[PDB]
Amino acid sequence: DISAKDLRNIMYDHLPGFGTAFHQLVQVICKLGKDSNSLDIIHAEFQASLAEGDSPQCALIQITKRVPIFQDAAPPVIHIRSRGDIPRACQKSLRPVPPSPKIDRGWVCVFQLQDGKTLGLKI
Numbered sequence: 001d002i003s004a005k006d007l008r009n010i011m012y013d014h015l016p017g018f019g020t021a022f023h024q025l026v027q028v029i030c031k032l033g034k035d036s037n038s039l040d041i042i043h044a045e046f047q048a049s050l051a052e053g054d055s056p057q058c059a060l061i062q063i064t065k066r067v068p069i070f071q072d073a074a075p076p077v078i079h080i081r082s083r084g085d086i087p088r089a090c091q092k093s094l095r096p097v098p099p100s101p102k103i104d105r106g107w108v109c110v111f112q113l114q115d116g117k118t119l120g121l122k123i
């Protein structure tokens with residue numbers, strides 16, 4: 001049985017760079033996938049998209065659109081201390097949080113900073 005860690009590493013292996021917004025999306029997909037016992041179908045959709053010739057980035061976006069736990073789901077809230085706990089390559093993707101953010105519209109997660117600041121990660 002594929003674990004959350006295994007799937008994260010499988011997906012990371014297809015991505016360029018490090019700590020990018022797509023890396024965080026992998027984290028969110030794996031976390032929510034584990035919590036809903038859906039790692040197997042997520043892995044299968046990921047591999048099927050690649051086998052079709054989609055880029056790995058496209059494959060990850062297609063997951064948020066084709067795997068039902070992500071359809072019209074809100075991004076998860078992640079509590080962090082400061083903006084510096086967010087990876088460097090994610091910094092320019094951080095945005096003010098919109099009224100009703102959705103994962104399948106590109107809102108990966110929402111960071112809640114300890115001082116009350118909030119930032120959404122947008123792809």
Ligand SMILES: Cc1cc(C)c([C@H]2C(C(=O)c3cccs3)=C(O)C(=O)N2c2ccc(CC(=O)O)cc2)cc1C
Nearest residue numbers: 004005024027028030031034076077078079080085086
């Ligand atoms: C709600 C949520 C979502 C995620 C992706 C994580 C990640 C994650 C996170 O992306 C960041 C923390 C500081 C900057 S980004 C972690 O550091 C982390 O360990 N997360 C994570 C990912 C998958 C799982 C599932 C599992 O492997 O059991 C559990 C935790 C933690 C939490 C609490």
